């Protein structure tokens, strides 16, 4: 008898009957492990969930260390002790023949990778997280079989199978000499549903020139049909060694017998906010509270995105709204509305185009970086497996990067057949595959971030956007924004741009001083995606009125626009307004957010040509017009030059001017009001 094996089984039985987590809402000593057994009797379950963090908090973690080190040796001992606890509480869960109970551990500490799989970790509890590519069907497995002989007629029960059709060599009846004749009894054999899942590396881990490795993960118990292809799941199990049955030198294959699958992409609409707030630390909630209270959060997140690229604040504003996205609403008939925002990067080459695409991939989770220079690498492909022989479905770029941003470079250098599959996934976010007798629909709720090049090198202002790019008409209409970066040779722009490159090459990481760190930005993006803003009644009249004014500029015939305003321009304003309210943690679409999205949409539609910071001049002008116009509505007296500077003294309380910088802002206000006097905006009576 195993002395060490019996000690673990005795300690495992007491862990499921003495451990209890105190509730914070009621304050009663409720046993989680005892109540889990009673819940398995009603639903008729055969798989338990035991957290690893609870095992380390008992006996100074002496029991969790023996299981995480030698899991295969103590595997029959853990299943034997579990049957004793169930028989004591609810003995009705044994009769179906005895049921086979499996233990599925979740919430594990260390999460190993595929490249870290070595031979020294064979037989230990690990955690491998990867993307699911190919999956097999639901087939049973011969676990505990029963062989009945023909001579002695003895039913040999409890016959384990170690991945091979093993037969008993001797009959329990001593008056028999049979060592070959054995018949399998199906009515007295225990069958289990097993499924092999071929996983791959994560989509966010894109290193240098390497080969993508695959791992055959075997699922057992209630883990069948839990790892869908195209979703990054967190597997948990032991590393088993499966030999070659066809060769029966013995060739071996490294496998991974998993017992629990945790989907990362999956984890009541109100419960989605309490989970993300409780999974973080206590200090993470305090850091998120001070950011929402800040009145200038929309200006700090733009400068924090891509700090190496100087300028281009209009293009950086769309990156923040693209990482959050809109609200994916479903109609009453079953149609799914597109909530993602697709932005295309059009401009002259050598304008920091590769820096913006590399920043999204190396930050946003589940992002695949590809280029335009195949048709199967983007969507999917039907490649037959060399082992099984059947036709399988291989994921591409639009499948592994689900619920993320797909960065595609050189969109104008694409073929005609390769561009047909892209437009198909830009409507219902689905990919229809009909080949080799496989008629299945795969979702593709991704965000395409194209970066094409104009035909001719430089962007011609005398032509339209359609004649300058090498794209079709339906594909160009899918993008909601078109940030045109013009390579203008200016003395003031090139001076400040060259100073940022020299300072970045010298100080390296010392010159980069963003207002928010990389860890703080990832926590605010995932938290803002759970918010669902609702359009109010006052904001509905402002969106329709703003849409009529934009459509009047295209029907007048004077300003020749580069693209005709269709129906998609109206739906693009709704998705852009929802992303702005999400960044401010507001569940109500205020009418002020529509004016911000209207200015960004008008800057992207460039018409076809037939001392003081510019960011501060527009802010000081928009606040001086509504203040004077409010006098005519209310009915006051007048507004002298002294009251003009005094108006901003109470509204700009967060300027942080102290005493030295405070007098500089007062002198700048006199120069701002002086330019409006010379121009045709404001005037002075006396």
């Amino acid at each position: 008898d195993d002395v060490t094996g019996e000690k673990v089984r005795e300690a495992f039985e007491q862990f499921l009957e003495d451990f209890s987590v105190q509730s914070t809402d009621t304050g009663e000593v409720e046993k989680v492990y005892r109540a889990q057994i009673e819940f398995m009797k009603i639903y008729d379950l055969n798989t338990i969930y035991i957290d690893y963090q609870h095992l380390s908090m008992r006996e100074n973690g002496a029991l969790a260390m023996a299981i995480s080190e030698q899991y295969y040796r103590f595997l029959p001992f853990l299943q034997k002790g579990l049957r004793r606890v169930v028989r004591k509480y609810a003995p009705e869960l044994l009769n179906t023949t005895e049921r086979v109970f499996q233990i599925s551990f979740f919430n594990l500490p260390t999460v190993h990778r595929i490249r870290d799989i070595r031979s020294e970790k064979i037989g230990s509890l690990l955690s491998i997280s990867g993307t699911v590519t190919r999956t097999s069907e639901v087939r049973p497995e011969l676990y505990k079989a029963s062989f009945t002989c023909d001579m002695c007629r003895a039913i040999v029960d409890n016959v384990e199978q170690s991945f091979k059709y093993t037969e008993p060599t001797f009959c329990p009846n001593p008056s028999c000499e049979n060592r070959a004749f054995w018949t399998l009894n199906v009515t007295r054999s225990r069958f289990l549903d097993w499924q092999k899942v071929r996983i791959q590396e994560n989509a966010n881990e894109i290193p240098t020139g390497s080969m993508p490795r695959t791992l055959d993960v075997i699922l057992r118990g209630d883990s069948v049909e839990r790892a869908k292809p195209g979703d990054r799941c967190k597997f948990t199990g032991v590393e088993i060694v499966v030999p070659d049955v066809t060769q029966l030198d013995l060739t071996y294959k490294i496998s991974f017998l998993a017992c629990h699958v945790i989907s990362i992409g999956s984890n009541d609409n109100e419960r989605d906010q309490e989970v993300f707030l409780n999974s973080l630390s206590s200090d993470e909630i305090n850091e998120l509270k001070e950011m929402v209270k800040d009145e200038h959060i929309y200006d700090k997140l733009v400068r924090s995105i891509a700090p190496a690229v100087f300028g281009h604040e209009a293009v950086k504003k769309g990156i923040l709204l693209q990482m959050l996205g809109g609200v994916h609403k479903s109609t009453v008939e079953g149609i799914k509305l597109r909530g993602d925002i697709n932005i295309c990067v059009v401009g002259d080459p050598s304008t920091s185009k590769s820096q913006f695409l590399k920043y999204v991939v190396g930050f946003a989770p589940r992002s695949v970086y590809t280029s335009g220079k195949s048709a199967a690498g983007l969507t999917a492909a039907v490649v037959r497996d060399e082992e099984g022989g059947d036709y399988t479905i291989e994921a591409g770029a639009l499948m592994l990067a689900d619920n993320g941003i797909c960065c595609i470079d050189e969109f104008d250098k694409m073929d005609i057949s390769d561009q047909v599959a892209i437009h198909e996934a830009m409507e219902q976010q689905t990919i229809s595959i009909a080949k080799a007798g496989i008629h299945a629909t795969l979702n593709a709720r991704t965000s395409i971030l194209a970066a094409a090049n104009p035909v001719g090198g430089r962007y011609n202002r005398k032509l339209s956007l359609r004649g300058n790019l090498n794209m079709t008409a339906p594909i160009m209409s899918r993008f909601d924004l078109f940030f045109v970066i013009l390579d203008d040779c200016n003395e003031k722009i090139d001076t400040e741009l060259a100073s940022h490159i020299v300072d970045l090459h010298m100080k390296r990481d010392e010159a980069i001083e963003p207002p928010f760190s990389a860890e703080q930005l990832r926590r605010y993006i995932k938290y803002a995606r759970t918010f669902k803003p609702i359009l109010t009644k006052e904001a509905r009249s402002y969106l329709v009125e703003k849409y009529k004014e934009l459509r009047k500029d295209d029907a007048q015939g004077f300003s020749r626009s580069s693209y005709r305003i269709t129906v998609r321009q109206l739906e693009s304003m709704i998705r852009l307004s929802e992303a702005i309210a999400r960044a401010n943690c507001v569940d109500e679409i205020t009418p002020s957010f529509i004016a911000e999205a209207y200015d960004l949409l008008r800057q992207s539609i460039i018409r076809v040509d037939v001392t003081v910071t510019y960011d501060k001049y527009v802010s000081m002008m928009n606040m001086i017009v509504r203040k004077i116009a409010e006098v005519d509505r209310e009915g006051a007296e007048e507004l002298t030059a002294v009251d003009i500077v005094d108006w901003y003294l109470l509204q700009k309380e967060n300027d942080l001017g102290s005493l030295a910088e405070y007098w500089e802002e007062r002198r700048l206000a006199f120069k701002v009001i002086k330019r409006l006097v010379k121009d045709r905006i404001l005037m002075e009576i006396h």
Binding site: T208, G209, M211, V241, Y252, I254, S350, A395, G457, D494
Partner: protein, 498 residues
């Protein structure tokens, strides 16, 4: 010999504890088996000089990694268990022989043929197979470079990727092969394999290097102290081509190139110099591409129509031993650290010119074909020579109209030289006398030894400066670079980085 070094290093470790008198566990140190990894030997024999008398000999190999195979488990300690009394045993494997027990060790059991081998409870070892390709610098002209199999054990696995120059210095063992998979016969040929002991790239890290000679460093600093360094190196890089002083001055800087200031939170900036030659042909244009390849240890020479968008990237080849889909490097991937010479740049297809847009910007090749979306790194300079359409650069035609190159491709280059073939009586007379002197005497007796540097000394001056000399842009140098960039636009950002 290695087995002796593993025992002498154990006795020396115990002597250091008694001499220091430390309060440490002596049982935990003596039980740890220490291994010695010798490398960098004097016997640097290649794969072609593998004589049959070198059986089980540590020979250093200097090749390149071709492909990579997954880790294969190797059984070391077998695990047995009885089927009657359930008696677990542990029998170690000696020289690949698994001595199975005939009878049970228990007195109550003692049944013959009752022990079951459980492969799930055995201690496996890491074993990786790496296919190494011969270095083209040592392969003679007219022969194809062969390959060899490598065996990596211990914790040195997962340390060599495809397209890396390493130095394997391990033993040269051999294993016999079987003529049939069901019989116990053996063929007359023996499969040769090199057991990898240490991995030195050209886990852990190199502490220092001892290349060249310190006596040659004094001669290097002697030429650096001279003021005529920019003119002496320009003439030694091409003593067979007359004139072209402005063209040779740019190619000299391409071999050196700026430093690579790597950033953690910033993007990678390409420090290579992309030079493009233009003008009329038959002006010693193809001879320049043949001289830089012989100097650079990783330089290649390809043509325009001879290599499409598949030969330059990574063609999906297959192994002739395992019949598996492998990934072989191309002309742009094998040159990781040198200068790529491409002939007839204007005769390339449209599918090939679009791939070079990403190599000249982020130095990365992203291929997404057959469901394999991987990004390959390719940080190397591109030295090509363009040609006009009618093979005659007309002076009354623009540069964009004479050459069929895309406007975005012209802005990605750093130096766009235009070597024209002007008819001059004073130039053709001096050029004919220079070419006639090279054919009269095999050695330039008229030129002094201090005017032309040999090929062996030129390669040692570039490899030494590219590993220790790192210039830093000061405040005085950065001020003139901004003023020069504004004045050029008053007469793209790619010209600033050049």
């Amino acid at each position: 010999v290695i087995s002796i070094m593993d025992q002498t290093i154990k006795d020396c470790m115990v002597s250091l504890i008694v001499d220091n008198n430390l309060d440490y566990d002596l049982d935990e140190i003596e039980t740890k088996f220490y291994k010695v990894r010798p490398y960098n030997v004097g016997s640097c024999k290649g794969m072609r000089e593998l004589n049959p008398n070198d059986i089980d000999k540590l020979i250093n190999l200097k090749g390149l990694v071709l492909r990579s195979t997954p880790v294969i488990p190797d059984m070391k300690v077998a695990f047995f268990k009885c089927n009657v009394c359930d008696h677990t045993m542990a029998v170690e494997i000696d020289r690949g022989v698994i001595q199975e027990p005939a009878r049970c060790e228990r007195i109550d059991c003692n049944e013959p043929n009752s022990m079951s081998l459980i492969h799930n409870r055995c201690s496996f070892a890491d074993k990786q197979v790496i296919k190494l390709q011969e270095t083209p610098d040592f392969v003679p002209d007219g022969q194809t470079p062969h390959s060899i199999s490598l065996c990596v054990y211990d914790e040195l696995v997962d340390s060599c990727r495809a397209g890396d120059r390493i130095e394997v210095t391990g033993t040269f063992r051999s294993i016999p092969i079987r003529a049939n998979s069901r019989q116990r016969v053996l063929k007359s040929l023996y499969k040769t394999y090199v057991d990898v002991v240490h991995v030195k790239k050209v886990h852990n890290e190199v502490e220092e290097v001892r290349q060249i000679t310190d006596q040659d460093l004094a001669k290097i600093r002697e030429v650096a102290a001279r003021e005529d360094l920019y003119s002496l190196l320009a003439r030694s890089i091409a003593p067979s081509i007359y004139e072209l002083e402005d063209v040779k001055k740019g190619i000299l800087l391409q071999l050196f190139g700026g430093t690579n200031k790597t950033f953690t939170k910033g993007g990678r900036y390409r420090g290579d110099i992309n030079i493009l030659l233009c003008g009329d042909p038959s002006t010693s244009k193809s001879q320049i591409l043949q001289y830089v390849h012989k100097i650079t240890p990783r330089g290649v020479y390809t043509s325009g129509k001879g290599s499409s968008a598949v030969g330059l990237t990574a063609y999906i080849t297959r192994d002739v031993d395992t019949k598996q889909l492998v990934l072989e490097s191309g002309a742009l991937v094998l040159s990781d650290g040198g200068v790529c010479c491409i002939d007839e740049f204007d005769k390339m297809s449209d599918s090939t010119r679009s791939v070079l847009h990403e190599v000249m910007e982020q130095q990365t090749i992203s291929i997404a074909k057959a469901g394999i979306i991987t990004t390959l790194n390719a940080r190397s300079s591109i030295l090509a020579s363009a040609n006009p359409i009618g093979s005659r650069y007309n002076p009354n035609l623009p540069v964009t109209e004479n050459i069929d190159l895309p406007p975005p491709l012209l802005s990605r280059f750093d130096l766009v030289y235009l070597v024209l073939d002007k008819v001059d009586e004073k130039n053709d007379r001096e050029l004919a006398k220079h070419l006639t002197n090279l054919y009269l005497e095999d050695k330039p007796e008229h030129i002094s030894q201090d005017d032309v540097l040999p090929v062996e000394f030129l390669t040692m001056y570039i490899s030494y400066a590219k590993e220790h000399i790192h210039p830093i842009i000061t405040e005085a140098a950065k001020t003139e670079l901004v003023r020069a960039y504004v004045g050029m636009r008053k007469m793209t950002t790619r010209q600033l980085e050049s």
